[PDB]
Amino acid sequence: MQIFVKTLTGKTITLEVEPSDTIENVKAKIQDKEGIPPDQQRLIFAGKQLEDGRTLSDYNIQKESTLHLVLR
Amino acid sequence: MQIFVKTLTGKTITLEVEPSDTIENVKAKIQDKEGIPPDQQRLIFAGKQLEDGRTLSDYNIQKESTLHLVLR
């Protein structure tokens, strides 16, 4: 399924993922596309910070869901 | 009536609502469209945070009004 990630600068990125994909895997996909190291990235969905040891399905993230990316 | 919700990434969503719709109901509509759980969403209008137990009419939100969505 496709998901969207918005940046602090107003950019939107589209990613192809599976509900069984891990958050760490998602961060890795972002690194590949934007060059941002996973340790400097924070992912938020519906006001909650997503953990690297959990999956998309655990957060009930559905197709065309939009995640927010924060930089540290 | 139609309303607009802007995201932190610069995306604009259009929703169909009634003045008697509750904010919780509006959040639920956003969840359906974006996959963001209501507990992770914060809605702001004219600088004020909207509560889940109040309605759109209570905030005098009129047709073509634009709300801002914040993620926690």
Residue A6's domain is classified under what CATH number? 3.10.20.90
List the structure tokens of B33: 């469209």
CA distance A8 to A42: 11
CB of B38 within 8 A of CB of B21? no
Pairs across A and B, CB distance < 8 A? 71
Question: Strand B66-71 vs strand B2-6: parallel, antiparallel, or unpaired?
Answer: parallel
Q: Name the closest residue on chain A to residue B10, using Cα atoms.
A: A10
Full residue range of the structural domain in which residue B25 is found: 1-72
Q: How many domains in chain B?
A: 1
CB of B55 within 8 A of CB of B22? yes
Tell me which residues of chain B have a C-beta less than 8 Å from any C-beta of chain A: 7-11, 31, 33-42, 70-72
